[PDB]
Amino acid sequence: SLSAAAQACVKKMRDAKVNEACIRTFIAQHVMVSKGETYSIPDSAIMPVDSLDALDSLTIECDNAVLQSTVVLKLNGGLGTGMGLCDAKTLLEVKDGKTFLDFTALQVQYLRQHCSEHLRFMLMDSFNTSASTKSFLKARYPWLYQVFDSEVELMQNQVPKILQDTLEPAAWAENPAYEWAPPGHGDIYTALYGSGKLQELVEQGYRYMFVSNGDNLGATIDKRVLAYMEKEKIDFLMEVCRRTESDKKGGHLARQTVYVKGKDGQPDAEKRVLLLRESAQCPKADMESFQDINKYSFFNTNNLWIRLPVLLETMQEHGGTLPLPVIRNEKTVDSSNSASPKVYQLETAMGAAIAMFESASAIVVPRSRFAPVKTCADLLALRSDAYVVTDDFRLVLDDRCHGHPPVVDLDSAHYKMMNGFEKLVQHGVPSLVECKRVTVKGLVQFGAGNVLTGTVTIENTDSASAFVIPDGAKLNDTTASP
C-alpha cells in the first residue's frame, strides 16, 4: 500500500536503527505529502479567538502534591542560524557573563532549595547540540552532569530529508550526516514516547509537564496554572500573550467550530476547537492576515502544560503516535551549497498538539513570562538594564517598563549576525529601561555609558565609516546623525 519512496525511507530508517515510534510518525507524514495537501492553514479555514481566561485574575494555588508531580523540560535542540550561530543558542551570554544555560540551571537549583526538593528537570537536545551542552554542564554544574545521560537529556530524533522530485531519501556523499535533520520541536512527543521516558514518568507518579523554549528565561512553574488545570480538568494548556509588533517569528492562536448533535433530548451545541497556525503554515498570499496583530492578537509563547497520563493514553490509542500537522520545509541538503539536491524537511510544532485533546485550552499570560531571543535585537534588550534578574533567577522586565518591552529595530544589513551585533555594543550596552523605541540605521557603534530615553533614532546615511556615539551621550526623543 506504501509508495516505493515511502518504503525506501522505512528501509533507511530501519537500517539506521531509528526507533519505530519515529518511523511510524514519519511515514504518516510522508504519505500525506505524497497524496497532495501540504497542511496549509488559509484564512478562510479559521476564525479569530475572542475570549480567554487570564492568569493575572487567578489566585488559587495548587497543593504540594500537585506541584511535586510536575516535570520541567526545556527545549534545546535547535540552532541560532538566523543570528549567525552554529551551536546551541543557549550558550550565548545573556547577562553578567552568564548564558541561558547558566540561568536555567540556577532556576532549577532554586526550585530545589525553596519549593520542590526533588524537582525533575529535563533538556531536549539534538545531534547538533548534545555535545556542547554536556561539556558545558560538566565544568559548571556537576550535579546536573552526574545524571545528565540517565535523567536530564532527552535526545530527539533525526529523520531523513527527502528529495523533492521523487520523495526518496536524499544522498549527499560529501557529508551523509546532512541527509538527516531533527524534525522540529513537535518531535518532543515522539521522542518521549519512543524512548520509554513518557511511560517511565507516568510510572513514577508524574502527572504534569511544563515545557518552554530554551531562549525564554521568563518561563517557570506557576502554581496558579496547575490549580486551573486541576479545577477545569484541562489536559493541555497553551500560554499566550497579547501580540505586539515585535512578535514576528512564531505562531498565533486561532479557532474553528464543530457541531455536535450531543445525545437526543438535548439539542446540538456549537463547540469551539483551538488550533495553532505557525508562520510556515500560512500561504504567502494570506500573509497579510497572519501579521495582523488585531485580528489574531494571541501569540503562542510555547509555554505549554501537558497532563502526562492523558498524552500517553491518546498516543497509544493512535497507533503509538501523535498525528500533528506537518510543516513541509524546502531546503538544499547542504545549506551552504545552493547547488546541492533540493529537498523537503518534514517538521512539526509542539504547540499544534492543542488540537489533539478534547479538553485543550489557552490562557493569557503577562509579558513577564515571555522574554524571547529570536534576533540580535532581542539580545540587545535582554543584555540591557531593561531586564533584571529575579530572586529565583528569571529574566523579567524592570518594573519601570510596566510590562512593555522596549522596541528595538536594528538594521538587518549590519546587525542580524552576532559578529555585527558585537560591534554595535563593543564599548558598552546602552541604558534602555527608559527607552520606548530605539531604531538603528546604517553602521553605528554605541559609546560607553549611553542612555536612551523615549523614542530614539540613530541614523548614518553613508555607511562607510561607523557613527560612533560619544561616551556618556544621553539621547531623549530625537534622531542622531553625523
Ligand X SMILES: O=c1ccn([C@@H]2O[C@H](COP(=O)(O)OP(=O)(O)O[C@H]3O[C@H](CO)[C@@H](O)[C@H](O)[C@H]3O)[C@@H](O)[C@H]2O)c(=O)[nH]1
x-or-dash string of contact with ligand X, 183-212, rule CB under 6 A: -xx---------------------------
- Distance from C-alpha of 250 to C-alpha of 280, rounded to nearest angstrom: 9
Please identify, using beta-carbon distances, which residue of 170 and 362 lies nearer to ligand X.
362
As for the chain, the residues directly before each break of C–N over 2.5 Å are none
Please identify, using beta-carbon distances, which residue of 351 and 430 lies nearer to ligand X.
351
**In terms of Cα–Cα distance, which of 64, 168, 172 is closest to 117?**
64
250 is a site residue for ligand X (CB under 6 A):
yes
Contacts of 99 (CB under 8 A, 6+ apart): 90, 91, 92, 93, 136
> Which member of 12, 74, 95, 374 is catalytic?
374
Q: How far is the CB of 319 from ligand X (least distance, A)?
A: 22
Contact window for ligand X (CB under 6 A) among 191-199, 203-211, 294-302, 469-477: 294-302
Where do the H-state alpha helices sit in 338-402?
376-383
Contacts of 93 (CB under 8 A, 6+ apart): 99, 383
- Distance from C-alpha of 334 to C-alpha of 176, rounded to nearest angstrom: 10
103 is a site residue for ligand X (CB under 6 A):
no
Please identify, using beta-carbon distances, which residue of 225 and 371 lies nearer to ligand X.
371
Contact window for ligand X (CB under 6 A) among 41-49, 246-254, 417-425, 445-453: 246-254
Binding residues, by number, are 77-78, 89, 156, 184-185, 213-215, 249, 251, 278, 300, 302, 374
182 is a site residue for ligand X (CB under 6 A):
yes
Contact window for ligand X (CB under 6 A) among 147-155, 177-185, 191-199, 284-292: 177-185
160 is a site residue for ligand X (CB under 6 A):
no
Contact residue for ligand X among 160, 169, 194, 251 (CB under 6 A): 251
- Distance from C-alpha of 308 to C-alpha of 313, rounded to nearest angstrom: 9
325 is a site residue for ligand X (CB under 6 A):
no
Contact residue for ligand X among 130, 190, 213, 321 (CB under 6 A): 213
460 is a site residue for ligand X (CB under 6 A):
no
Mapping DSSP onto H, E and C, the string for 413-429 reads: HHHCCHHHHHHHCCCCC
Please identify, using beta-carbon distances, which residue of 43 and 278 lies nearer to ligand X.
278
430 is a site residue for ligand X (CB under 6 A):
no
- Distance from C-alpha of 477 to C-alpha of 287, rounded to nearest angstrom: 33
Binding residues for UTP, by number, are 89, 156, 184, 215, 374
**Shortest-Cβ-distance residue relative to ligand X:** 250
Q: How far is the CB of 229 from ligand X (least distance, A)?
A: 20
Contact residue for ligand X among 153, 215, 222, 239 (CB under 6 A): 215
Q: How far is the CB of 91 from ligand X (least distance, A)?
A: 11
Residues from 347 through 376 that contact ligand X (CB under 6 A) = 349, 351, 372, 374
Binding residues for substrate, by number, are 185
374 catalytically annotated:
yes
# residues near ligand X by CB under 6 A = 25
Q: How far is the CB of 397 from ligand X (least distance, A)?
A: 16
Asked if residue 182 lies in contact with residue 338, where contact means CB atoms within 8 angstroms, the answer is no
Dihedral sign for Cα 165, 168, 172, 177, please. Answer: positive
Q: How far is the CB of 350 from ligand X (least distance, A)?
A: 7
The dihedrals phi and psi of 424, each to the nearest 5 degrees, come to: -55, -35
124 is a site residue for ligand X (CB under 6 A):
yes
CA distances from 425 to 97, 128, 422 (A): 15, 29, 5
Element (H, E) at 68: helix 64-68
Q: How far is the CB of 4 from ligand X (least distance, A)?
A: 28
CA distances from 54 to 137, 238, 241, 298 (A): 37, 12, 10, 12
Asked if residue 345 lies in contact with residue 35, where contact means CB atoms within 8 angstroms, the answer is no
Please identify, using beta-carbon distances, which residue of 182 and 405 lies nearer to ligand X.
182
Asked if residue 298 lies in contact with residue 2, where contact means CB atoms within 8 angstroms, the answer is no
Q: How far is the CB of 70 from ligand X (least distance, A)?
A: 20
Dihedral sign for Cα 137, 143, 144, 147, please. Answer: positive
**In terms of Cα–Cα distance, which of 454, 478, 482 is closest to 468?**
482
Beta bridge partners of 467: 444
Place of cell 552554529: 86
249 is a site residue for ligand X (CB under 6 A):
yes
Dihedral sign for Cα 191, 195, 198, 199, please. Answer: positive
The single-letter DSSP state of residue 406 is P
Q: How far is the CB of 75 from ligand X (least distance, A)?
A: 4
Place of cell 502534591: 65
Contact window for ligand X (CB under 6 A) among 3-11, 300-308, 407-415, 447-455: 300-308
Please identify, using beta-carbon distances, which residue of 326 and 456 lies nearer to ligand X.
326
Contact residue for ligand X among 8, 33, 78, 219 (CB under 6 A): 78
- Distance from C-alpha of 466 to C-alpha of 462, rounded to nearest angstrom: 9
Which residues participate in catalysis according to the annotation? 374
Q: Which residues bind ligand X (CB under 6 A)?
A: 75-78, 124, 126, 156, 182, 184-185, 213-215, 249-251, 278, 299-302, 349, 351, 372, 374
